[PDB]
Design an enzyme around this catalytic site. Structure first.
Site, PDB file in Angstrom:
ATOM      1  N   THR A  13      67.580 -26.944 -13.732  1.00  0.00           N
ATOM      2  CA  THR A  13      68.280 -27.630 -13.068  1.00  0.00           C
ATOM      3  C   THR A  13      68.827 -26.463 -11.774  1.00  0.00           C
ATOM      4  OG1 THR A  13      68.807 -29.214 -14.525  1.00  0.00           O
ATOM      5  CG2 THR A  13      70.233 -29.417 -12.531  1.00  0.00           C
ATOM      6  N   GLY A  15      68.464 -23.141 -11.708  1.00  0.00           N
ATOM      7  CA  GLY A  15      67.425 -21.694 -11.378  1.00  0.00           C
ATOM      8  C   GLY A  15      66.687 -21.486 -12.620  1.00  0.00           C
ATOM      9  N   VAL A  17      64.713 -20.211 -15.837  1.00  0.00           N
ATOM     10  CA  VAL A  17      65.218 -19.491 -17.124  1.00  0.00           C
ATOM     11  C   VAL A  17      64.071 -18.656 -17.507  1.00  0.00           C
ATOM     12  CG1 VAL A  17      65.680 -20.662 -19.370  1.00  0.00           C
ATOM     13  CG2 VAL A  17      66.021 -21.948 -17.410  1.00  0.00           C
ATOM     14  N   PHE A  73      68.488 -18.576 -28.081  1.00  0.00           N
ATOM     15  CA  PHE A  73      66.924 -19.123 -27.979  1.00  0.00           C
ATOM     16  C   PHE A  73      66.513 -20.006 -29.007  1.00  0.00           C
ATOM     17  CE2 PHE A  73      62.296 -18.815 -28.410  1.00  0.00           C
ATOM     18  CZ  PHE A  73      62.007 -19.063 -26.985  1.00  0.00           C
ATOM     19  N   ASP A  77      61.583 -27.808 -27.160  1.00  0.00           N
ATOM     20  CA  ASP A  77      62.362 -29.007 -26.558  1.00  0.00           C
ATOM     21  C   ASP A  77      61.981 -30.395 -27.209  1.00  0.00           C
ATOM     22  OD1 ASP A  77      60.975 -30.114 -24.483  1.00  0.00           O
ATOM     23  OD2 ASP A  77      61.215 -28.447 -23.575  1.00  0.00           O
ATOM     24  N   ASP A 118      74.622 -34.641 -18.338  1.00  0.00           N
ATOM     25  CA  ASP A 118      73.213 -34.793 -17.888  1.00  0.00           C
ATOM     26  C   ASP A 118      72.253 -34.616 -19.244  1.00  0.00           C
ATOM     27  OD1 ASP A 118      71.081 -35.067 -16.103  1.00  0.00           O
ATOM     28  OD2 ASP A 118      70.999 -33.021 -15.499  1.00  0.00           O
ATOM     29  N   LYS A 120      69.156 -35.087 -21.601  1.00  0.00           N
ATOM     30  CA  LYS A 120      67.894 -35.559 -21.362  1.00  0.00           C
ATOM     31  C   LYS A 120      66.910 -34.811 -22.431  1.00  0.00           C
ATOM     32  CE  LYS A 120      68.039 -32.369 -17.540  1.00  0.00           C
ATOM     33  NZ  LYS A 120      68.176 -32.984 -16.128  1.00  0.00           N
ATOM     34  N   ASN A 123      66.550 -31.035 -22.677  1.00  0.00           N
ATOM     35  CA  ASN A 123      68.045 -30.275 -22.846  1.00  0.00           C
ATOM     36  C   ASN A 123      68.513 -30.345 -24.238  1.00  0.00           C
ATOM     37  OD1 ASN A 123      69.666 -32.473 -22.186  1.00  0.00           O
ATOM     38  ND2 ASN A 123      70.252 -31.457 -20.077  1.00  0.00           N
ATOM     39  N   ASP A 136      73.267 -26.656 -22.454  1.00  0.00           N
ATOM     40  CA  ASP A 136      73.737 -26.861 -20.999  1.00  0.00           C
ATOM     41  C   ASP A 136      75.079 -27.818 -21.072  1.00  0.00           C
ATOM     42  OD1 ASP A 136      71.664 -25.404 -20.217  1.00  0.00           O
ATOM     43  OD2 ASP A 136      70.753 -27.021 -18.998  1.00  0.00           O
TER      44      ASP A 136
END
Length: 289
Positions: A13, A15, A17, A73, A77, A118, A120, A123, A136
């Site tokens: 979202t 920047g 990764v 890490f 996902d 947020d 989803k 994430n 996040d």
């Protein structure tokens, strides 16, 4: 210190990764570059918000007028895992395990007065051990949720609660329960529940499934900033049609996660006690890394 680029993790979202190795400790991390002193304090407090189902925030680096977040890490996902599971679907026992774990993470964050806002599939991160973790948390309060990402990608509206869409300024932990309910449905049916492509399409897709909300089901809705009396009046559909082949316990829980009135919507803590979880287990997913 300094880490390598490894293999551009992905465009977030806020920047880029990176997968990176810390050269002193040898640990492999996710490094997020964020495109402002209030934000620094708020994000720094998230270093203490530790739980097995929350992706660990290792460090907050402010330098050269630039902010980097160093996270634990994880290799996969839920979006990728769902895409990879498309032909058979995720087995119900694994859906149940993942929902249970995500509710534990939310109950923890919510108990510390931290919202995600947020959630989803992108994430929600999974490992080989059968764990799933929320990534996040807390960043939306710090940075806002933009219409477009730093690379102009559209931020998805699919998981957004109706009180946010109707202009409520002071939303609550209930917004995360809504999002998680939408994700639960998507795991079960293998299709997004409300894949809107604009704010009004998002709202009208919600209304076409759950009924247009009114003062009976949602006291105060007609006084919401973005509520319009001209909204079409759709009847509410049966969950038996919306999320087949989910059983009565799962449909009951989903209905409580998708209540319109955020005050009526089930809490994460109460959801953990729901009869749907009576037979919860922790299966091993089949992961190809």
């Amino acid at each position: 210190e300094n880490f390598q680029k490894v293999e551009k993790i992905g465009e977030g979202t806020y920047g880029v990764v990176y997968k990176a190795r810390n050269k002193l400790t040898g640990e492999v991390v996710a490094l997020k570059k964020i495109r402002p002193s209030t934000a620094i304090r708020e994000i720094s407090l998230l270093k203490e918000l530790n739980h097995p189902n929350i992706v660990k925030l290792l460090d907050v680096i402010h330098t050269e007028n630039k902010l980097y977040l160093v996270f634990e890490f994880l290799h996969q996902d839920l979006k990728k895992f769902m895409d990879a599971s498309a032909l058979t679907g995720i087995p119900l026992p694994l859906i149940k395990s993942y929902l249970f774990q995500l509710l534990q993470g939310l109950a923890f964050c919510h108990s510390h007065r931290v919202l995600h806002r947020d959630l989803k599939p992108q994430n929600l991160l999974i490992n080989t051990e059968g764990a799933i973790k929320l990534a996040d948390f807390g960043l939306a309060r710090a940075f806002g949720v933009p219409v477009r990402t730093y690379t102009h990608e559209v931020v998805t509206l699919w998981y957004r609660a109706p009180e946010i869409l109707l202009g409520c300024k002071y939303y609550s932990t209930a917004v995360d329960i809504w999002s998680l309910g939408c994700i639960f449905a998507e795991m079960v049916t293998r299709r997004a529940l409300f894949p809107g492509d604009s704010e009004i399409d998002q709202l009208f897709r919600i209304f076409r499934t759950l009924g247009t909300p009114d003062e009976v089901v949602w006291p105060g809705v007609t006084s919401m900033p973005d509520y319009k009396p001209s909204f079409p009046k759709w009847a509410r559909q049966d969950f038996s049609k919306v999320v087949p082949p989910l059983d009565e316990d799962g449909r009951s829980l989903l209905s409580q996660m998708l209540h319109y009135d955020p005050n009526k919507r089930i809490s994460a803590k109460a959801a953990l006690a729901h009869p749907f979880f009576q037979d919860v287990t922790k299966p091993v997913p089949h992961l190809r890394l």
